[PDB]
């Protein structure tokens, strides 16, 4: 059983541990937001705006840093920064949960605001490090480990997505059970300790991956960062894979989704916790099914064909959702149609996400890989920022319908862009 020590499985294990830590810490921050502050749209929206704006500004910088440095150095530095930021965030969360009563009742009104500012800043740093490690590990390391074998690359990307979704659905359950059977302070302490141990393990895991793969070793003072940012965006605009990236970014403008504990429109609206949990589980299983569908489609059709088919599926499911919205309290038929439309949209969208990921991994030269992927993340977070702005501007319930249309419209728009990419690449159906 040499599979347990191969580069591919060690990469899988490292990604699994990193994603588990990330999701546990995300759930801890969500619990911090819910317990201290009420179910407020403004606070979660401000957190999302801060994270999205920071990544939008610094995507090119992070990509350039990944591109200009050795692979092991950037991977380990990003790992250490992410885990240390998560450890500090966990310690602060344990401290606030320990003094929750005093903060809510006895202490002045500025201490809670200071705690929120500190938590969102540490979360922004952790998310920046997570974006850096995602860029480097996924793009560079998975492409190099796969090499010239595209089937292996597609299987590795699909397995990464499956691990990500399973962790997204399991880590909230584990942290919730731990917190309830103990206390939120115990939960935050466990999260901090687990992140420390996982950092220690993942350092050695990345070092061992770097050994078994010998191909990884080959490869105003703000004028320079601004020049790198401009050069990165100009290079991104001149890539053949640009409309596909634009479509993938536009697919982030949607409100229709159940994959996020906080910053989700359904939770902000006031939907019951049990229904939200059921919908998140259904979205996770359907996302796994979508990754399987992508892996199957890529072999039969091409890759651009796989993207087109996935976009067609997602548009059909969102058409079902629109029919639900326009269908004449509210009848349970409309709600069931909307939920089915969103879930089947997820199954049709994960395949397109994997297709665009494979296109970026294949058609971006090794010299521009980090910068182009950083700019792609910047575009994704820019359209996520637009989504958060839209959610802020329309908080009243009797506008939800409108949002749906907007969201669906953008999806269509995104896929239209990808369709143009197809016409620029194949010229055949």
């Amino acid at each position, epitope marked *: 059983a040499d599979y347990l020590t191969s580069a591919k499985f060690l990469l899988y294990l490292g990604h699994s541990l990193s994603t588990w830590g990330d999701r546990m810490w995300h*759930f801890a921050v*969500s*619990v911090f937001l*819910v317990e201290l502050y*009420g*179910n407020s749209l403004l606070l979660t929206a401000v957190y999302g705006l801060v994270v999205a704006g920071s990544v939008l500004v610094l995507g090119a910088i992070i990509g350039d840093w990944v591109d200009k440095n050795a692979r092991l150095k950037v991977a380990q530095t990003s790992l250490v920064v992410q885990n240390v930021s998560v450890i500090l965030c966990g310690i602060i969360l344990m401290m606030v949960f320990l003094h929750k009563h005093e903060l809510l009742t006895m202490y002045h009104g500025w201490v809670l605001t200071s705690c929120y500012i500190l938590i969102i800043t540490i979360a922004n740093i952790a998310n920046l490090a997570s974006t850096a490690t995602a860029i480097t590990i996924q793009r560079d390391w998975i492409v190099v480990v796969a090499g010239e074998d595209r089937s292996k690359l597609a299987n590795m990307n699909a397995t990464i997505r499956r691990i990500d979704q399973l962790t997204n659905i399991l880590a*909230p*359950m584990a*942290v*919730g059970q731990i*917190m309830t059977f103990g206390s939120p302070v115990i939960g935050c302490g466990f999260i901090s300790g687990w992140n420390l141990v996982s950092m220690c393990v993942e350092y050695v895991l990345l070092w061992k991956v770097y050994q078994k793969t010998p191909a990884l070793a080959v490869k105003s003072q703000m004028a320079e960062p601004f020049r790198t940012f401009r050069d990165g965006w100009v290079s991104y605009y001149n890539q053949p894979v640009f409309l596909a990236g634009m479509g993938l970014a536009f697919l982030y403008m949607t409100v229709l989704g*159940f994959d996020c*504990i*906080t910053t*989700g429109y359904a*939770y902000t*609206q*006031g*939907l*019951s*916790g*049990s*229904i*939200l*949990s059921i919908l*998140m589980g259904a979205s996770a299983i359907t996302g796994i099914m979508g990754t399987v569908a992508f892996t199957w489609l890529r072999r039969k059709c091409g890759l651009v064909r796989t993207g087109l088919i996935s976009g067609l599926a997602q548009l059909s499911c969102l058409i079902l959702c629109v029919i639900s919205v326009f269908m004449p*309290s*509210v*009848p*349970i038929i409309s*709600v*069931s149609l909307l939920f089915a439309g969103v879930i089947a949209a997820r199954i049709g969208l994960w395949s397109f996400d994997l297709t665009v990921t494979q296109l970026l991994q294949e058609n971006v030269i090794e010299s521009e890989r980090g910068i182009i992927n950083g700019v792609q993340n910047s575009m994704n977070y820019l359209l996520d920022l637009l989504h958060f702005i839209m959610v802020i501007l329309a908080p009243n*319930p009797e506008a939800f319908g409108l949002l749906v249309l907007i969201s669906v419209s953008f999806v269509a728009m995104g896929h239209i862009m990808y369709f143009r990419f197809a016409q620029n690449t194949l010229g055949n159906k």
Partner: nanobody
Amino acid sequence: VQLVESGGGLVQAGGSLRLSCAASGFPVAWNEMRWYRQAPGKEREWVAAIASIGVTTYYADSVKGRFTISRDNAKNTVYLQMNSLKPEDTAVYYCNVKDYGMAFWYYDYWGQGTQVTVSA
């Protein structure tokens, strides 16, 4: 996200009553609203419920038929209409919300409660 109750009092056996539960911090059209009875000398018991997504009622067998639970989203309230009250229904009624929160972190939120007395 507390909710209050009103409409309790003392009525003759076989009369009619309407208990109104007003919620503030959440929608009532998407949360499973419930009613509970707490009788003197014994633990609280289930009375009625209403679904979260649709509109379905789940009255308990002991009080099924003579009770009605109806939600109103415009006023964000839940009404328990009690008809043909019996002397053993004298208790304290608690409005309840089950599974309110985020995805995997939800709780049960109770109300102050209203005293209902039945005499013959």
